[PDB]
Amino acid sequence: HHHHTDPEKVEMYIKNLQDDSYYVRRAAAYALGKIGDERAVEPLIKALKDEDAWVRRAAADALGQIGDERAVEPLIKALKDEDGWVRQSAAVALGQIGDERAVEPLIKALKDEDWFVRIAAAFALGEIGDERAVEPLIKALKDEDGWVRQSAADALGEIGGERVRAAMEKLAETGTGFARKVAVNYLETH
Amino acid sequence: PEKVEMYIKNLQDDSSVVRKAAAVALGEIGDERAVEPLIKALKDEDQFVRIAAAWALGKIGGERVRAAMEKLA
């Protein structure tokens, strides 16, 4: 059986976002993200401030699935959460929304202590496609983590433009290691 | 809490964020049962599920090494 978007099911899960249990609050945020009904936006925003990190993570995730821009400013605040997975979730959600107000908080997240947050910030910057990210991404080509380094290289390919082209033309001669290979490959594929 | 089999099941959910959340949950449990399902999740179509599975396997492996060294010391 396949189902229609059910308003009674969404109202149930909205109420469940204020449930005493954290497992119920978490499951509600995931079900609301899966339904993708915009009624869930303001209650999901309130859940980004939940006491439990699992619920905040789920609310950020669902808000990115829904893709509503009302969530931009609260997701910018969640990029500063104490929990690493909340920050990773908020970066992905901001990339999905694609609103340019997230560019500067995402450039800061490229310097996160967690490798998984840095990948998600690079990926979100590649999605937004804003040139302001170029020099911060070129710097992330020296990340200690290889997956962070590839994510920054993939995001540079996504942005393109004259700033990326001039930066890659230079880096193919001035760079070392992975960064130099990135620039050489960029020049052969463009 | 014996909810490990529920998250192992969630590693097959159609919602990429549910499968990612399952891999993270399993990394935070630290149970060896999650090892074979998480190694499979390293081939997931979604980048973030793969990242969560590599992270979870690291957390489980560290806990395994720590508990074994703890017994010795």
Author numbering:
A (entry chain B): 7 to 196
B (entry chain A): 13 to 85
Task: Recite the paper's sentences.
We have recently reported the design of a new artificial repeat protein family named αRep. This design was based on a specific subgroup of helicoidal repeats commonly found in thermophilic microorganisms. Artificial proteins based on this design were shown to be well-expressed, folded as expected, and extremely stable.
